[PDB]
Write an enzyme that holds these catalytic residues in place. Sequence first.
Site, PDB file in Angstrom:
ATOM      1  N   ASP A 114       0.845  -1.196   0.000  1.00 16.15           N
ATOM      2  CA  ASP A 114       0.000   0.000   0.000  1.00 16.15           C
ATOM      3  C   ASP A 114       0.879   1.244   0.000  1.00 16.15           C
ATOM      4  O   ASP A 114       1.378   1.661   1.048  1.00 16.15           O
ATOM      5  CB  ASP A 114      -0.889  -0.016   1.233  1.00 16.15           C
ATOM      6  N   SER A 119      -0.555  15.439 -12.174  1.00 18.39           N
ATOM      7  CA  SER A 119      -0.789  15.071 -13.559  1.00 18.39           C
ATOM      8  C   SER A 119      -1.037  16.322 -14.398  1.00 18.39           C
ATOM      9  O   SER A 119      -1.595  17.318 -13.929  1.00 18.39           O
ATOM     10  CB  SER A 119      -1.985  14.119 -13.644  1.00 18.39           C
TER      11      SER A 119
END
Length: 330
Positions: A35, A199
Site C-alpha cells: 500500500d 498530472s
Amino acid sequence: STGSATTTPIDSLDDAYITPVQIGTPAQTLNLDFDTGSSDLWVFSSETTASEVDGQTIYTPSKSTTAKLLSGATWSISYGDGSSSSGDVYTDTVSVGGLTVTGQAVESAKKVSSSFTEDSTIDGLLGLAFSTLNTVSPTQQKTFFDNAKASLDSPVFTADLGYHAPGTYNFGFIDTTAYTGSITYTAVSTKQGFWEWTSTGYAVGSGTFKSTSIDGIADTGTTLLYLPATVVSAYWAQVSGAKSSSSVGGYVFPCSATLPSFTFGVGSARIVIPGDYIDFGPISTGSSSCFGGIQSSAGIGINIFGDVALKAAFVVFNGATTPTLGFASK
C-alpha cells in the site's frame, strides 16, 4: 541488494493485490497488500481477537526465534474507506522477494474492522508511503522500504500491476524489459506523507487532451481512480446510460456498454487506461448495472491514482534524497 516478488489479484475484479512476505524465523509467509498510501506493516496474528479472524493466515511471534516485543509500542490506523485495525508491535526479520530487513517493525493486530475480517485473502498490509505517516506510538517506526533503501542497489521500488493477471513489485532496480518507451519522471511532494504528484491533464477515449493540473497520490492500496467531479462527469458522459447513483455510492453504467479509454498526463507523456480496466462488474450479484472504476474524489479531499490507473503503467517510486515518481507505458 535487490528483491522481486509477484503480486496477484485477490479476485476476478482486481479489487486488491497480494504479495507473499516472509516474517520471522523460521519464516511465516503471509500475503500482504502492498500500500503506497500508508506506512504501517501490520498483520493478522495469534493476538487477533478470534472472532475477527475468518480464514486469514496469522503471524505467531512466539514461534519466531527472531521476534522481539517492542516494549510499550502500540499502533492504530484508520483508512480512507472507513476500515481500521490496531494492536502491539514486534521487531522481526522480514523478507520480500529475496530482500531481507532485520529489525523491521511488524505491527500485530489485536483488533481489525469487519471489512478486514470478511476478506480472507488479505493477511495484512505493507505500507510503502513515507515513514512520517507510521502510526506506532510513542516511537514512530520505519517502513520496510525505508529500512531497506540504504542496502539497495538503487533507492527505488517499482510497481507493475497486472490487469486480471499477476504482476511484480521490484526493490532496488528498474527492469528495463518490463515497459515500453521511456520512463517519464515527475516531481513529488512529501508534505502529506504520500507519493503526491501533479498530472498534466486527461483525455476521454479518442477525444482531445485537456491540459489541466491534477494533484493526486499514487496509491497501490486504493482500487479505483478518484478524480475531480468535472473530469469524472466528462468521462461518464461518453457512456450511454451511465449515471451517478446516490444509493449505490458512485457512477454506475449498463453492463452491456463498451467503455472508452481514459488517458492521463505525466509531463508530456500519456498513460492510456483501456476501457475494460474501468469495469468493476455488477453492483450486486446478477444485476445488469455495473460499477465504474473512475469515481469522484469530491468527498475525499484528495485525488487518488489507484490501481485502475497504476496498472496501466510501469511505476517507479524513486526514494532518492529528493523523491520522484516515474511512469512508463507497458
